[PDB]
């Protein structure tokens, strides 16, 4: 509990937003056949045209306003194009003689959005709401989208929409003003309402596991990264256990104290419980890498584009599992019983560190040598694995930013999923369908199992070039007879052009635990 | 013995050793090839060769006392086969008994004096036979000329390649593991060769507990763990020990030995342990191995590729050889001899308390040095272990330590290098490798590279600023810590370890031995 | 024979300076016993100090010049220490009124001076002769010095004093030398003026960069030298080479503007041949390594014009094998010249080539080209029936790490032959250690698809594995190898040093 | 030959061959000082 200190300095946990802006804004979803009204802040139409590449604009949606239905007539709209992201800002005086802004965003000329088109479109609607002090936003859905695409719209929105401040002191925006208003427009809107409060939860677990991404390694520790994940439990009313070095030394976890040993931070394993009220009928384990910082210890992160000052991401797959932990404790899912679990730990220099060539002794009795200390993940994962599958779970589900082969594999818009179960694997494709977190199925090639072969322990850490495949071999190695898939974030964390985490994972592993 | 550091419960606090080795059950009968050679259970095998005739026919020339084995085994029937160096084959049959005989042999194929080298490929053909075979009992028949030395060599390298280290195997031991529990070895004039049994089964001791903390990783050998593994050999063997801790280290003023044990969890260590004849002692020697029981590198961290930092738990390699000669000398006893073993142990790590690049430390003998490299902090513990050698009035010093990766470059794996500031002890040291078939090359320390050693405000340099002849300027620094002693320096940084086996050598033990002895 | 050019600016030959101002200096020996003259230019004395930190300088000489041994007394030459190189020179007037230049150079405390050590006391002599306009230099040597090492003195003052102004766009007349036993060195004065002329000839062809030096200037300059001394001469041109099917050697210069030129020169001796000799030379005028290219930091491409100093050395030999003309000997001086480039027409990593003894070489790496070229070489001059076969190359940048810049290693197939070279090696004072060829690891160069892999896959022991290619190519001769990859080029002084030249010829003229 | 489940389990001939001599050397207690570990071979040269 209590976090270490060098200097008084030092901080002590990790700021946390829970009510955020996005969470005082009134949505009102309403159908679009009863009439577009236009009286304040600003109406954003999302317009396409079918077939004609960079057509022109054409406002369908009846306007309840003699003089903004002039002004949107097809005569003055033509001028105007469709194509992908583009945005125009429109000024006119409605029927009540008060000034109101009006535009649009181009939303192409493919009938069906991808989730990279929507983003597209989402991120130009944000340009709208950035630098400009608005009340009120109000979208007019003139595009065919489905449920979870309308919830992946609102979700992005909220994500992108927020800015992250708990850094800023003296470099705070000034001019940072918020939207107390979102009107949505509509077909079939009565169909689309449920997805609102939805939208609102996943953004909020994104948003959450992106907080703790963020937060520099000073500030997320092991210790304070166990303490937030103490508080979100009490919050939730979920079951919480925190396993210390001496519980952790009981349960014999070798690998995973191994890679602790050279950190001023005690290790900290998280164990958080939601159970449903009424019959279990399908247990789940999801156990997320949590390298609070990742220095890759005496194989130091050395080596010109090693990204070592990326490595406080390293507990991403943690942040999602927790994310999910919000999401499904808010959700409240029944006949399920799901384990959220990290095996805490920074990977640092030190005299105290493990040493490249260590044979140390997983939680299962497997001895493994050390080949290199920066493949540190998999072995706090070979004890998180073993530790799962205790538990007499259906299904164990890994996430981690493992290997950085990912992003010379998949890059960094899809996310590698490897596993032992084929139902399991088709669960994941499915749930990275309807969540629109873009996932690739990766083989585990049974061939490279020889190159982990060690002269002296029982099993090598890692092979002496397909990483993220031999990682997955390694992994494999944990679990005996239970149904397990790993899914490697390493590449998609990390959004690069935006300098931000992604809180990837989050709404992939809810809607995974939801629609089983 | 002391209590060896512990970050959390599950670090390991002691090496394990297999003292009473599967090799140690083997019961070995020499016979003369002249009585004729009975073949019965087990596995027979003929090591043939074929002098001028490359790939010649097997020819087997022993008299064979069945008549259904030597039937089978005659010229016609053998000449389908051939000598070629490493060859084998398996045969099956039944002998004058009606009982099945499982008979073979390995190809030395057309030259009559076999290397070192070529004994090797023969004996690892051998232990492929060996290997996923449940026997009993292995026969050798010699159909080769071999001197009492490779003879010897060649049951020490059989010993230590059966051998299978499992210390570290918990869920993976290999069910099937089974040893011979005999060893027949048929040979001309048996009786001269008898005495080279049990040296040999000595010999492979000293090599393969050598090689057991080689393998042992860093974890599990570490300063403490080293010196008390040390301990408990010297007592088994009733030898002198001693064991010097940092307070003791800080008295004898070993500034250059202690500033690379600065930045470990683990205190320093010197091991000194003394054999000594009971008659009169004729000749003094110590011998000193580097004892470091991981390289870092420190703040020069072996950060750049082909570094091989994941090897360097063999960084005692040097320590572990003295260890196995201690070993083989406790147990040999020679006489007329007062022989001193012994390690500056440290680990070369990197913390807030370690020594930096350009630090300026002083040596027991009272010179200053400027550390250039943490990295070369091999020749700074040699350097105090070398003046504290010097302080006991021996006739030889001879220090052995996996030093330069130069050594891979130009020596490359199979020849050690030796450097001297004597002649006499050189040649001795050539002698030894001779004999106990451990190669070695005699390289020079070229005095024109001193001056690039000195220094602008130390008294010496620790490493050229390069210059790149590495092995010869470490050589150079170390010569200036023995005044006035015969010494001798084995470069063993590329010999050390068996890349394609994936295992150490316990190179040197027998070298070290067999220059005690000769002595 | 014409060179070819890209422009009408590139040269067309090497510029040799024959008549150097070093063969103009007159030199008198003289012994200690009768006193030293000081009557003009520069006197210096050799002295040391046998107990010393360096302990003070002190004269033991007797001089012929109440001015000069009153600045030579003890009280005086106290102030001066003897730590080796350290020097002191001052201007005064002698008895007769005239100035003469007095100073000392210090020779350290160890009365048996190294070849290393005697440098240093060069060095620091030339350091007064080039900031010194002289007619005469005169050195009193009050140190033991044997006849070896005299010469070794001289060669080495004469080389060092020599400046090669050859591509930029005032010496002493006479040298004395004041010596005890002095009949005893004087046959040793016109033996290190031909050793230092066949060493700084080596160091032109060396210094002469690769648009200077090409295979074409390089075989020209090797008959001009041939012509001057009367040696038998033959230039193999590439339809030669086709012919004698030297597939390994053609391969390397494939990509060179310049054609491959083979050079063989010979000297027969009067009377009796007692031991023929063939001494191969690695001749690469510029090695850019090919597609292998030299483009990792440190691989000191801008240095390549220097891998002909095999080539040199062996024509510096012939320079003096021609000039001192030792009886009972016939000598074969080869080299296979090429130059190693990047072009449409280069060989390439992975080719499969063919030597002349009919043996198939995969190509592991285009910068182990002088191993080809030696091969080559090797099968033709074992062809000419010889007892010994001595090749000298720049072959493996491993010996920087192995022996470093002072001694270059010595391998071969014959105990015999290597003991001759390392006794070479004492009497010319040119520092040679000897390597071992270890066969064991002869199974790296085994090849999928060709006979033999031109290099081992990791190599660990490069110049020792280059030993066991080139021993492919020597089939019943006594043969050994010298790698001077790591002692050619002086660093230090930015220069070569023209290794190998008197090593050659004290092993021919010693034999 | 395999020898399902039992890992690096002994050799078990279960062919009749219509050789003596062979079929002798094939029994099980000959077989089983063997072992199926993949790629694991032996081999002999006997009479039929
Ligand atoms: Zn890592
Ligand atoms: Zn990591
Ligand atoms: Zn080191
Ligand atoms: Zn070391
Ligand atoms: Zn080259
Ligand atoms: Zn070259």
Redesign the pocket.
């Known amino acids: 509990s209590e976090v270490p200190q060098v200097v008084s300095l030092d901080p002590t946990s990790i700021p946390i937003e829970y009510n955020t802006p996005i969470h005082d804004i009134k949505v009102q979803v309403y159908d679009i056949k009863g009439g577009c009204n236009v009286e304040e802040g600003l109406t954003i139409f999302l317009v396409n045209n079918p077939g004609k590449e960079n057509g022109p604009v054409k406002i369908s949606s009846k306007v309840n306003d003699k003089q903004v239905s002039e002004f949107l007539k097809d005569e003055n709209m033509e001028k105007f194009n469709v194509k992908l992201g583009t945005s125009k800002h429109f000024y006119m005086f409605n029927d009540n003689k008060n000034s109101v802004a009006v535009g649009y965003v181009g939303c192409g000329s493919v009938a069906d959005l991808s989730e990279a088109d929507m983003k597209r479109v989402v991120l130009s609607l944000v340009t709208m709401l950035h630098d400009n002090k608005l009340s009120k936003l109000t979208v007019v859905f003139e595009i065919n989208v489905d449920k979870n695409l309308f919830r992946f719209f609102l979700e992005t929105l909220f994500y992108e929409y927020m800015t992250d401040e708990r850094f800023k002191s003296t470099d705070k925006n000034v001019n940072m003003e918020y939207i107390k208003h979102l009107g949505v427009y509509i077909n079939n809107a009565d169909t689309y309402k449920e997805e609102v409060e939805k939208a609102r939860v996943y953004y909020f677990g994104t948003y959450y596991a992106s907080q703790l991404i963020a937060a520099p390694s000073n500030y997320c520790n092991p210790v304070s990264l166990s303490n937030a994940a103490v508080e979100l439990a009490q919050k939730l009313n979920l079951e919480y256990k925190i396993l210390g070095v001496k519980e952790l030394e009981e349960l014999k976890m070798g690998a995973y104290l191994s890679v602790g040993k050279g950190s001023m931070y005690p290790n900290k394993f998280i164990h958080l419980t939601y159970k449903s009220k009424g019959d279990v009928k399908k247990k789940i384990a999801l156990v997320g890498?949590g390298?609070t910082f990742?220095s890759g210890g005496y194989n130091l992160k050395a080596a010109p584009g090693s990204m070592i000052d990326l490595?406080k991401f390293?507990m991403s797959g943690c942040a999602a599992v927790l994310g999910c932990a919000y999401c499904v404790g808010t959700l409240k899912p029944e006949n399920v019983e799901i384990h959220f679990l990290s095996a805490v730990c920074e990977?640092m220099v030190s005299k105290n560190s493990y040493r490249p060539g260590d044979i140390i002794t997983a939680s299962n009795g497997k001895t493994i040598e050390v080949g290199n200390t920066?493949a540190?993940?998999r072995l706090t994962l070979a004890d998180a694995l073993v530790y799962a599958e205790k538990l007499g779970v259906d299904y164990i589900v890994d996430i981690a930013?493992?290997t950085g082969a990912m992003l010379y594999s998949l890059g960094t818009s899809y996310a590698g999923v490897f596993g032992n179960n084929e139902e399991l694997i088709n669960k994941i494709l499915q749930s990275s369908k309807t969540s629109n977190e873009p996932v690739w199925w990766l083989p585990i090639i049974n061939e490279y199992r020889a190159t982990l072969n060690s002269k002296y322990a029982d099993i090598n850490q890692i092979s002496s070039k397909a990483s993220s495949i031999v990682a997955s071999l390694f992994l494999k190695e944990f679990v005996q007879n239970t149904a397990w898939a790993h899914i490697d974030i390493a590449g998609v964390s990390w959004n690069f052009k935006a300098r931000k985490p992604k809180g990837f994972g989050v709404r992939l592993l809810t809607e995974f635990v939801l629609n089983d």
């Open positions: 890498k390298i990742d490595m390293d990977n920066d540190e993940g930013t493992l």
